[PDB]
Symmetry: C5
Subunit: 108 residues, 5 copies
Amino acid sequence: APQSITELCSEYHNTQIYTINDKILSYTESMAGKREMVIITFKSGATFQVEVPGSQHIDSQKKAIERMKDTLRITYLTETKIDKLCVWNNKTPNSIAAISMEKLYAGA
Amino acid sequence: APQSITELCSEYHNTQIYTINDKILSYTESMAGKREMVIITFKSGATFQVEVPGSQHIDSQKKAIERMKDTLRITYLTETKIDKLCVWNNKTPNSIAAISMEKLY
Amino acid sequence: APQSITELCSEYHNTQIYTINDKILSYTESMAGKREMVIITFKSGATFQVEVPGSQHIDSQKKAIERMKDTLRITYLTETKIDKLCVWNNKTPNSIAAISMEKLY
Amino acid sequence: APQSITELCSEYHNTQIYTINDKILSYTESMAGKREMVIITFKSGATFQVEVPGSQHIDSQKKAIERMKDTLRITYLTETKIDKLCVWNNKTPNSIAAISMEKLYAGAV
Amino acid sequence: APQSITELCSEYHNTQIYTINDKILSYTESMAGKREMVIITFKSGATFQVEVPGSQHIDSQKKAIERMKDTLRITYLTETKIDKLCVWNNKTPNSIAAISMEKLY
């Protein structure tokens, strides 16, 4: 198993690491039919989504998607700084594949 | 996929964006049979609901409804400011379709 | 759909609105067989419960009950002030049907 | 339905109320096979568990067990004071059956 | 039932207790197909994971895994200090089997 979000992104096609290093500016959540998704944007202008569950996803991904949306909401509400985002750039807005957060009052 | 709550609202009939720009005044939650819903109101007088799961909803719009209700509760409790609300105006009170929040911290 | 907890309570028999206007004094949760419930009390002496899921509950209520119990726990932990409680008075202690929370902010 | 954790504990065999009146000292959670449980201890030395789901538990107890573990974790994290604990003393460590939490009150006893 | 994380770790093969005594430095969560996992690292350089649900895992382990990932996220967000970690060292990075947290105030 990968030990980094970067290492993890390297295993997929059409993924790309975006160094956010900032907290979420806006959180949008929809329960509208066929558009059950979450959209987050940063002051950098960057906009991402946790795309509507469908055929692009496998079964094990069902819970992961819900968890990802749970994470984005709590991250937004607690004003937690997001470090990097591994996203699929072949989707508009870019679909989130993985998220990493780092509390840096130290190093590594 | 839409990149905005406004853009998302544009894809539906009977929807309408309400610029709330305020925190939830009251949170009401019911578990009473046939009225399992959540009602939120703002000091503006505006009142909205996350309607009882019915036949008007598609299969896995089921999880989204629960999540919407989870979001409204945590938003209320944390006194988080809600920006906009895409709602279906063909329901009384207006049913929530999407919610957007932005912290200009 | 009702726009108020009071309006909602009016639709049911054996319900009654109780103006709590106070935070939860005690939170009791049981996972003991046949008594999987939650009991909350206020300094007013008032005691309420989210009764054990049974034959009087339709399947739409199943998630609502769990949500109600989730709400009471987080309300208690965050010391959030509860406004009103629509409860079924034909149960001892009174069973919670709906809860409303307001804020003078 | 009982109106108290004490009244509730009275309905069961092998149960016993412990007046903790303190916050959780340690929270231990395991996902190891056959030992999916939670263990909490207090500075009093008292140690309790939310035992691994099995035969002794029924089917509505399934969600209640998960909820109990959810409650212990949030209680621990928020440093919330636990009042009493109705536990089954026929298990080691004692298995948690119910938990009660009181929130101050200058009105007094 | 064991009464300690260390006593619990002793019941398994390929497990090992790591005394972390520190808060999580980084939290990584993936929903990418076949890599639905969580990775946490500490300033000590130590890196652990809650491995992708597979075959080693029985069935009641399904909820435990989700719970473990829920715990790591909330622990990270609240900057809570983790005491010990019982992990399976036969995986890279080491897979988390159990976690213990203490206060000592």
